[PDB]
Amino acid sequence: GSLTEDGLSYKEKFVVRSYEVGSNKTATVETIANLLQEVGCNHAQSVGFATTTTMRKLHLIWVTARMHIEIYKYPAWGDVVEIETWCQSEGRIGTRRDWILKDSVTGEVTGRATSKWVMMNQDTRRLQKVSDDVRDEYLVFCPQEPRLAFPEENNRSLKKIPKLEDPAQYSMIGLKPRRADLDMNQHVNNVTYIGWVLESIPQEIVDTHELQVITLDYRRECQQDDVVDSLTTTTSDSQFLHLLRLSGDGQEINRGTTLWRKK
Amino acid sequence: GSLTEDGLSYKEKFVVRSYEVGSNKTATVETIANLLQEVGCNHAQSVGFATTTTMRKLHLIWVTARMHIEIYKYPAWGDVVEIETWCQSEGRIGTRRDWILKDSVTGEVTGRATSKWVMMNQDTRRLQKVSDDVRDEYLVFCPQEPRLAFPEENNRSLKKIPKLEDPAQYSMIGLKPRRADLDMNQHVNNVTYIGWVLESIPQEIVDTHELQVITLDYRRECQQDDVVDSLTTTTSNDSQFLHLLRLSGDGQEINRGTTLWRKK
Ligand SMILES: Cc1cccc(C(=O)N2CCC(C(N)=O)CC2)c1
Ligand SMILES: Cc1cccc(C(=O)N2CCC(C(N)=O)CC2)c1
Which residues participate directly in catalysis (chain B)? Predict the structure, then answer.
C-alpha cells in the first residue's frame, strides 16, 4: 500500500482469500468491511498517526456513527481488488472517511463506501464537537475541496433510518461475541455488528439475492457480557429494516437498512 | 505465492492485518490457523486441484482428523511472515500436510504445524482407506523421502488425548456459528472449532500467558442448528489444559484437545 502522488489519499491491493468468500465463491460483505478497515488503518499509519497529538492528551477518540456500503460486483476468490481511501473534515460535527473499490485487472469501480466519525471521550463515552486545534492537525492530510464517494444529491448514504416496531418479521436471538470478534483494544470489531445485522435475514434470501446496499447507524457498543438480538422486517429488489438491541432490557445498539438484488 | 524450485512445496508471504491481532498487537492463533489454511489452498490450486480426478468421480473428500500447532513468536501487526507448506502420503491411512512459519526479515522459524487428513465419502460421511489410484495421483506432488515439521522421537503432535470428565473446571455454553463462520461449501470452518476450544480458557490466563502449543482432534462436525459447549480443565512457568467440545443437547463429542501456555 502507498499514499498517492499528492499525499491526500491512500491505495492498497488485496488478493481475495479462500476463507473470505461465501457460497458463490465471492467475498462476503464482512470481508469487504474488514478490508475497508485495514486500508483505513494503513492510511492513518502512513501519515504519522487515528488519534492526533491533541486528542491523546485530552483522551479523545474517533468512533463510527454511520457506515454506508454499495457493492456492484463482489470480487471472486483469487481476484485482486484495489481500494482507495481518503478523509475529509465535516466542520465541528466530525470527520468522514470514504473508499472506492476497483477491479485491479479492468480498473472498473466495483464498489464504494462512506463513513461518519464523531469525537468521543474514551472514558466517559461523551461526544464532543471538533475543536480548531484537532482540525488543522487533521486538515493537512485531507483534500480541501470536497471529494465524495457518494456525490449524488439525495443519495442513500444520508437517508434517515426509522426504528423497527415490534413484532419483527424475522429474528436471531442471543448473539454473543467470541474473542475473535474483539479488536486489539478489547472492543467488539465494528464488522461484527454487520454480521449480527445480517444474521436475521432468512437463508432463502441470502441464497437467491446479492446484497447491493447496507447502511448502519451505531448508537451504543456491545459491552462486556452483553448479548444481542437481531431483528428484521421487509419494507419492500427487496429492502429490509434492521434493529440490533440488548437481549435483556431491549436497549438499542444499532439500526440499519439493506437493499438486495435477485441473482 | 509460488511453488519452490523442485515443485514439491509452496511458499507464500503475508502482512499481518490490524483486525488479525489481539491485545498484545500480535496475530492470534486463529489468524495463524486461517493463514495455514490459505497457503494450503494456494498450494493445491498451483498443482492442478484438494480432490483428485478419482476422488471427484467417487464423491470422496479429504477431512481433518487432527491439527497440531506450535508457536515460538507470534508476528506483530504489520510484520511479514513467510509460510512454507507441503504434503506427504501416510500409506493407506491418509495424508499429512505440514507447515513452517518464518519471520520474513530474520529468516528465523517462528512456528510449525502439522495436520492429519482422512478420506471420506461426501454424502454418507463414512471414512475409507486410500486406494492405489488416489495415492498415485497425488504422490507426484509430494516429497518421496520423509520431510517432517515435527521430526523429534516422542513429539507432542502424536500424543493420545483423553476424554475430559464431568465436572469441567471451566466452561462456555451455547456457542453457535454465524454465517462468517461458514466456508464456501456451507460447512463450519475448521478454525472456528479452535476459537470455540479457546472460549472456555479464563480471560486471566489469556491476559498473562501466551499460547505455545495446541493439539486438536476432530471427531464430528457442528451441523445445521447445532449448538456447542466448550469445556476445559487444568491438567498441570507453564500451564496445560484438557479441552472438550460437545453438542449442547445430547452431549455428543465433536472435538477434544490440549493446550500448553507459557507465562509472558
Ligand atoms: C472485552 C469484551 C468486550 C465486549 C464483549 C465481551 C464479551 O462479552 N465476550 C467476548 C469474550 C468472552 C470470553 N472470555 O470468551 C465471551 C464474551 C468482552
Ligand atoms: C449451513 C450451516 C452449517 C452448520 C451450521 C449452521 C448453523 O447452525 N448456523 C449458521 C448460519 C445460520 C443463519 N442462517 O444465520 C445460523 C446458525 C449452518
Answer: 185, 187, 222
Residue B64's contacts (CB-CB under 8 Å, 6 or more residues apart) are: B115, B116, B117, B190, B218
Locate the chain A residue with the closest alpha carbon to B34: A19
The number of beta carbons lying within 10 Å of the beta carbon of residue A42 is 21
Residues 6+ apart with CB under 8 A from A31: A16, A17, A20, A21
| Nearest C-alpha neighbor of A261 from the set A45, A73, A115 | A73
Report the gap between the CA of A149 and the closest CA in chain B (Å): 24
Tell me if A183 and B30 make a contact (CB, 8 A cut-off).
no
Instruction: State the Cα–Cα distance between residues A211 and A205, nearest whole angstrom.
Output: 9
C-alpha cell at B88: 506427504
Closest residue of chain B to A76, computed from CA coordinates: B184
* Alpha helix positions (H), chain A: 29-46, 53-57, 134-137, 190-199, 203-208
The CATH classification of domain B2-156, taken from the options 3.10.129.10, 3.10.450.50, 3.40.50.620, 3.40.50.300: 3.10.129.10
Nine-digit cell string for A23: 457460497
Residue type (1 letter), B91: G
For residue A88, report the phi and psi dihedrals to the nearest 5 degrees: -140, 145
* Inter-chain CB proximity A206 and B23 less than 8 Å: no
Q: Is B177 in the pocket of ligand 2 (CB under 6 A)?
A: yes
Q: Which fold has domain A2-158?
A: Thiol Ester Dehydrase; Chain A (3.10.129)
Please give the class, per CATH, of domain B170-263: alpha beta
Cα A28 from Cα B180, distance rounded (Å): 8
Rounded-to-integer distance, Cα B102 and Cα A151, Å = 46
Residues with Cβ within 8 Å of A108's Cβ and at least 6 positions away in sequence, in order, are A102
Yes or no, beta carbons of A182 and B22 under 8 Å apart: yes
Burial category of B147 from C-beta neighbours within 10 Å (exposed 0-12, middle 13-18, buried 19 and up)? middle
What resolution in angstroms, rounded to 1 decimal?
1.8
